[PDB]
Structure formats: structure tokens, C-alpha cells
Design a protein around this ligand. Structure first.
Ligand SMILES: [Cu+2]
Ligand SMILES: [Cu+2]
Ligand SMILES: [Cu+2]
Ligand SMILES: [Cu+2]
Ligand SMILES: [Cu+2]
Ligand SMILES: [Cu+2]
Ligand SMILES: [Cu+2]
Ligand SMILES: [Cu+2]
Ligand code: NA
Ligand code: NA
Ligand code: NA
Ligand code: NA
Ligand code: NA
Ligand code: NA
Ligand code: NA
Ligand code: NA
Ligand code: NA
Ligand code: NA
Ligand code: NA
Ligand code: NA
Ligand code: NA
Ligand code: NA
Ligand code: NA
Ligand code: NA
Ligand code: NA
Ligand code: NA
Ligand code: NA
Ligand code: NA
Ligand code: NA
Ligand code: NA
Ligand code: NA
Ligand code: NA
Ligand code: NA
Ligand code: NA
Ligand code: NA
Ligand code: NA
Ligand code: NA
Ligand code: NA
Ligand code: NA
Ligand code: NA
Ligand code: NA
Ligand code: NA
Lengths: 168, 169, 169, 168
């Protein structure tokens, strides 16, 4: 056993490794969206900036899970980061709808990881996940939902441009 | 049997103040409902939300100032149920402002009727308190909501609703 | 038919939050009644008044934070009548604090029952939100009111009530 | 007619002169109370300070009515300022009860003066009285009422001394 290890099940350790890969994947998706809105034929720099920031924070979320794995005495096992499903992401509205589905899948995987901690009595891991991950996912899902509603309200064309200049 | 401060303060004015207190609290509740309606994920107009949040707190403060006045004159505060608002959801920004205009006018008419009670009982100090602290602000509020309605008709639905939120609200 | 944010959020938790919202608003109304009772000319304890004024605004803010949470998770806020408090007047500072202790404990028990609803439906995020944002403060509030009751029994009526107002309150 | 005079009835002018005398009288009463609490055998310096301030403000209330009389074109006619009814004022509680009755009589006389302005259509005088006199009398009567309630609560002896040090 590694020196720190106490009340830390191998199933939780494996679940953290798989969550690490999913955060890195989400980071890659947002990096793709960032560079898509930076295209000369899309050219929405504040949408670009938004996905750049989201890409950096998903990757920080990954690192915080990596730090946690080491803190509890787990061992980090990295896997390929899959490329995103698409090369281009359509309208600002479609990109946000794609983002909502992504954040919800990440949230479901965090809830499943919390279930692993719960069944093995890992009280500290449950609280770590609730405070550091579940709370932010709820805020992020709300924020993307508001974006989708406003993008439907303002419509295509001028409205997409104004939303970029104002909210984003 | 009169309270220590009481002078030139009729029981009908005291009762009228208690009724006005409930109506300010009711209006506060209406605005707090509108605040949270515009905070919904499928409405999501954060500056309309903040406007009704502020309106809800001013109405609650208007209620408290009436409560303080009741005590100052030697009246006794008698609280009643605060009815829930008529609707759970308030439609478009335009419809919500139209609902607000009718509410503020209803509150104004009840303030004017309360002023009439003070007047017929010779309560000079209460008339002036109402004029300076309530009637003046109701006239400003009714004007402001009217301007909002006109601009919301001008900008129309969709992008205009969003721009009004970012600019005026 | 689900709202955009909704995930792992049961209708029973949503209903429980709406019920807790009404109970926080009710407690706010109770404290606002106590605030204005201590502001009466024949009670006239201005620091007890300010204490319940602040308590009334925190309860109203606790209600709003629950309303915001309901929207965040994709629930729909359904408001109900805010019942008037049981009494119009609250007796001595000691009796008012004893009334407050029972109220805060009632609110705490309803928060614990709301936590049980989240727990049985596996709502990990809602349990933590309740623990950090509501249960922790209810425990601090219940302790603080208990200290007030003990000191009010120690100082007794008359001068002691006045000194407690000037010093601790 | 004096140069400024417009819509200013002789009955209002006379009523202001009589209100002037009543404010000066109230000022004299409070000056007596001030010096009574300054006695070596009473010795409550914050009660003394309170009645000193009230004496100064009654006399400022008198001067503001004198200024108003001149503003409207009335002529100030002064009368004897009667000495107060008593030379000594008993307990802090009794002095406050005496003060409440005094402020209420002054308030009733202001309301009667407002009636004179009303029946002669003197809109400006009514508003002057409401804003500058009636509002303050209501605040003063409330404040004295609170004092009486607290003086009954704290009782005689130590309570009188503590009230002097704390509220007064
Ligand atoms: Cu993440
Ligand atoms: Cu837990
Ligand atoms: Cu926890
Ligand atoms: Cu109002
Ligand atoms: Cu609470
Ligand atoms: Cu005066
Ligand atoms: Cu008038
Ligand atoms: Cu006026
Ligand atoms: Na296992
Ligand atoms: Na597993
Ligand atoms: Na690209
Ligand atoms: Na760019
Ligand atoms: Na590795
Ligand atoms: Na959609
Ligand atoms: Na769980
Ligand atoms: Na959020
Ligand atoms: Na947003
Ligand atoms: Na919107
Ligand atoms: Na009547
Ligand atoms: Na009536
Ligand atoms: Na709502
Ligand atoms: Na509702
Ligand atoms: Na409602
Ligand atoms: Na209209
Ligand atoms: Na009305
Ligand atoms: Na159920
Ligand atoms: Na239930
Ligand atoms: Na009261
Ligand atoms: Na009541
Ligand atoms: Na009550
Ligand atoms: Na007890
Ligand atoms: Na309960
Ligand atoms: Na005459
Ligand atoms: Na006369
Ligand atoms: Na003397
Ligand atoms: Na002295
Ligand atoms: Na003279
Ligand atoms: Na008395
Ligand atoms: Na009059
Ligand atoms: Na006052
Ligand atoms: Na006082
Ligand atoms: Na008192």
C-alpha cells in the first residue's frame, strides 16, 4: 500500500482516473470550439474567448482530480484523449446546445463517481466531489441554459453579433 | 386608554394604514415573483430580474415606513396574510410591465383613498407625510413604468427585448 | 418536457423546496412583526428591534437563495400565501426569544426533512447545498438564541432588560 | 399693506405671534429643567444636556416663526415670557411626563394655527407648518414617549443613573 492510503478503494481510484480522462476530453472539445469561433468565416471573438476559458478550466478540473488521486495515494493512469466528434460546430446556438449535452454527461459521470465513493464509505471523497465538482457543474449547466435561451431570443444574424459583444 | 403619543389620530386612519401596509407587502411579493420569473433559465433576462428585485425591496421598505409611522402616531400594527400573486408566470417583458403599471396605479389609488381619510379627520401631519413620502414617488414610478412600456413596444420582441435588458434595465 | 437544466432533480425535492420557501418567508414575517413590536412606544427597546429587523431580512434572503436554487436546478417556483404570525404582540424580551427559539427549531426540523428527501432520491448536490448553506447557519442561530435566553433569565426584568439591549443587542 | 403681503390674513399673523410666545415659553421650561438636573442634589448631567438642547431648539423654533412672520409681511409683537409653573421637576420620570404634556399642548396649538391658515386659504403657510413644525412635533412626542417607557422599565436609583449614562 502507498503511504497515504486510508479508506480509499481501488474502484474509487479507477473512477478518478476515468473522470480525469473525461475532463481532458471536455477541455479538448472546448479548445476545438474556441478555434472554430476564431475562424475567419465565423469570427465571433467573444464566443471564442468563452470556450478558451472553458477549455482552461476543464483542464484545471482534470489537474485537481490528478492532485486528489496523489493525495489519497492513488496512481494516475492516463489514456488517449479522444478527438472531438466534429471539426466544426455550426451556429453559436448549436455550439451551446452541444455544450449543454457535454456538461450534463460530465455531471452524470461525476454523480456516478460520487456513488462509488458512497458505497465504499469514502466520506472525504464524497465531500470533495460535492464541494469541488458537483456545485460547479450545477452552476455551469444553469449558465449554458441561459445562453441557449438568449440565443433563441436574439436569433441569427445581428443578434448573434450583439450577444457576442454584450453578454459574451 | 389611549397610547402615549396619540393626538389627532383617528381609528379610521389607523385602520387605513394597516390596510395600506398589507397592500405594500403584497406588491413586494408580486415583484419578488417577477424577479424570480425573469431569473428562470427559459426566460433569462438578468436586468429585468434585478429591476423587479429592487422594486420588491422598495415596496417592502415602503411597508416598513408605514409600520414605523403607525407606531410614531400611537397606532397599533395589525398584520394580515400576504396573498400570493395572481399568476405564477408573467409572460413577456412587455406584459410584465403592463401588469406592473396596473399594480402601481392600484396602490396609488389606495394611497389617495388613505389621504382622503386623513383629510376628513383633519389630520394635517398625516396628509403631508403621505404626500411627501408616498404620493410623490408613486407619480414618479408610474411615469417610469409608462416609459418602459413605450420603449418595449418600440423595440419589439426578440433582439429588442435583449437590447433593452442590456441598455436601459 | 423537462426544463433545460434538470438532471438528478426529483419532483418531490422541487415540491419540498417550494414548501421551505414559504416557511422562510413566514419566519421573516414573524421577525418583522417582532421588530415592529419592540419599536412600539410602550415597549421601546431599539436594539431588540434592530436584532429582529436583521433576522427578518436574513430569513427573506434565505428564502431568495432557495428560490434561486430552484431555478438553478430547473425547478419551478410556486408561491403560496404568507400566513400572518400567531400573535400581534410578543410579551417580554425573554418571551420573544423563547418564541424565536421554537421557530428556529421548527425551521431546522423542516430543513432536515428536506435533506431527507434529497438523500432518498440520491441528490448529492442538493444535500451538500442544504448542509453548507442552511443547516450550518441554523445550528449557529439556535445556539445564539439559547445564549440570549440564558442571559435574559440571568439579568431579569426591568433594568436588566434595558442593559441587555444596550450591551449585547 | 406691507410690501410682501399677499394671501396673508391678520388672523394668521396674530396666530403666529401667539405661537412665537408659546415656543419661547417652552424654551424657558426646558431651560429650567436643564438647570434643575444640574443641581448638586440632582446631578444627572446627561438629562441636563438633553433639556439644554431642547431649550435651544424651542428657541430656534420661535425664531423661525419670527422669520416667517417677516417673510410674509406680518409684524412681530412680543409678549412676556411666563415663568414655568414649577421651580423643580421631581424625578427624571416626572420631568419627562411633564415634557410630554408640554409638547402635546404645543402640538395642539400648531394644529390650531394650521386650521387658521386652512380656513383663509393660505396654502403656503399650511405647508410651512406641516414640513417645519408638525413633522418635528410628531417625532418629538414619539421620542419622549420612548423615554417615559424606558424610565418606568429601569426604575429609580441605579436605573436612573444608567439611563443618564447610556441613552441620554
Ligand atoms: Cu469539469
Ligand atoms: Cu453526505
Ligand atoms: Cu457534505
Ligand atoms: Cu409603494
Ligand atoms: Cu432561515
Ligand atoms: Cu417647538
Ligand atoms: Cu394640504
Ligand atoms: Cu403639503
Ligand atoms: Na469494485
Ligand atoms: Na465502478
Ligand atoms: Na476550427
Ligand atoms: Na478570435
Ligand atoms: Na499514465
Ligand atoms: Na434547445
Ligand atoms: Na451518491
Ligand atoms: Na450559474
Ligand atoms: Na449565461
Ligand atoms: Na433571454
Ligand atoms: Na370612520
Ligand atoms: Na375607511
Ligand atoms: Na419563477
Ligand atoms: Na408563484
Ligand atoms: Na407568483
Ligand atoms: Na399598453
Ligand atoms: Na385600489
Ligand atoms: Na415522492
Ligand atoms: Na415529501
Ligand atoms: Na407592533
Ligand atoms: Na400583527
Ligand atoms: Na403579528
Ligand atoms: Na426557556
Ligand atoms: Na417543523
Ligand atoms: Na378672523
Ligand atoms: Na384665531
Ligand atoms: Na434649578
Ligand atoms: Na450638569
Ligand atoms: Na414686540
Ligand atoms: Na406615564
Ligand atoms: Na388643519
Ligand atoms: Na422619533
Ligand atoms: Na427616546
Ligand atoms: Na424600554
Amino acid at each position: 500500500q502507498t503511504q497515504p492510503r486510508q479508506n480509499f478503494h481501488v474502484e474509487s481510484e479507477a473512477g478518478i482516473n476515468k473522470q480525469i480522462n473525461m475532463e481532458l476530453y471536455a477541455s479538448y472539445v472546448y479548445q476545438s470550439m474556441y478555434m472554430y469561433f476564431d475562424r475567419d468565416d465565423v469570427a465571433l471573438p467573444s464566443f471564442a474567448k468563452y470556450f478558451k476559458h472553458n477549455s482552461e478550466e476543464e483542464r484545471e478540473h482534470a489537474e485537481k482530480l490528478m492532485k486528489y488521486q496523489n493525495k489519497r495515494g492513488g496512481r494516475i493512469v492516463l489514456q488517449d484523449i479522444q478527438k472531438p466528434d466534429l471539426d466544426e460546430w455550426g451556429s453559436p446556438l448549436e455550439a451551446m446546445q452541444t455544450t449543454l449535452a457535454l456538461e450534463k454527461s460530465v455531471n452524470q459521470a461525476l454523480l456516478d463517481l460520487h456513488k462509488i465513493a458512497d458505497k465504499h464509505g469514502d466520506a472525504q471523497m464524497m465531500d470533495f466531489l460535492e464541494g469541488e465538482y458537483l456545485k460547479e457543474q450545477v452552476d455551469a449547466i444553469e449558465e449554458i441554459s441561459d445562453h441557449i435561451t438568449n440565443l433563441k431570443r436574439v436569433g441569427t444574424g445581428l443578434g448573434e453579433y450583439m450577444y457576442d459583444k454584450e453578454t459574451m
